[PDB]
Amino acid sequence: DNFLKIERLAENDLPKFIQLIRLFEAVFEMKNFSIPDSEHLQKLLNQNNFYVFVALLENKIVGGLTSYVLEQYYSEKPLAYIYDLAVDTNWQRQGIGKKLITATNQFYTEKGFEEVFVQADKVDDYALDFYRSTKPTAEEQVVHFYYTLK
C-alpha cells in the first residue's frame, strides 16, 4: 500500500517503542505482563547493538520487529538477530511483514553485515510460511533449549 510506512526508531522514539511492545503483548498473547520503566526502555533504545523497525499507518503502529547486533569472531562482518516480529491481527497479510524484513536486511546490508537470521516455532505455521515467503537464503530445523534462572 502507499499509506503504510516503514521506519527505524531512534532516541526520541520511546513512545513508538512502547506502542510496539504493547502490540507484542497483544499478538503474542502475553499474560500478566508488566512493562519495564521508561528509563530502562530508553537506555535499551539508545544501544548501538539494538535496532527497532515499525510499520506505521499515520500514527498507528501496525507491525514491527526488534533486532540485535552480534559482532562476530569469525569475521569482521557482524550478524543481526531478529528476536521478535509481529503484525497486528487486523492487518495480517498486507505485505507488512515482508516490508519489515526487506527494510531490515537492506539496513544491515548497508552496514556491511554478513547475515541476518530469525527463528520461528515449528508449530507456528503462519510465521513459518511467512518467513518462507521472504525467500531466505536457507532454513534449518533446530532445537531451542533454555535455562530459567533462579
Torsion angles phi and psi, residue 114, rounded to 5: -85, -35
Cβ-based burial of 20 (10 A; exposed 0-12, middle 13-18, buried ≥19):
buried
Task: List the x/- string, 86-115, binding to a copy of itself by CB under 8 A.
Answer: ---------------x---x--xx---xxx
Sheet holding 79-87, edge to edge: 5-8, 50-57, 60-70, 79-87
Q: Does 10 bind Cl ion (CB under 5 A)?
A: no
Using the minimum distance from each CB to a copy of itself, give the nearer residue, 10 or 30.
Answer: 30
Is 95 annotated as belonging to a binding site? yes
Nearest Cα residue to 27 out of 52, 81, 77, 64: 64
Q: Identify the sign of the CA torsion 32, 33, 36, 37.
A: negative
Site string for a copy of itself, 38-57 (x = CB under 8 A): --xx--x--x-xx-------
Place of cell 502507499: 2
Q: Side chain identity at 114, as an amino acid letter?
A: E
Residue 105 partner contact from a copy of itself, Cl ion, none using kind-dependent CB cut-offs of 5 to 8 Å: a copy of itself
CA 87 to chain centroid, in Å, comes to: 10
Q: Is 34 in the site for Cl ion (CB under 5 A)?
A: yes
Q: Is 122 in the site for a copy of itself (CB under 8 A)?
A: yes
Residue 128 interacts with a copy of itself (CB under 8 A): yes or no: yes
Q: Is 104 helix (H, G, I), strand (E, B) or coil?
A: helix
Residues flagged as binding site: 7, 11, 13, 32-33, 37, 46, 48, 76, 85, 87, 92-95, 97-98, 129, 133, 150
Can you give the binding site for a copy of itself, defined by CB under 8 A?
17, 21, 24, 30, 33, 36-37, 40-41, 44, 47, 49-50, 66, 68, 70-76, 81, 83, 101, 105, 108-109, 113-123, 128, 131-132, 134, 136-150
Can you give the binding site for Cl ion, defined by CB under 5 A?
34-35
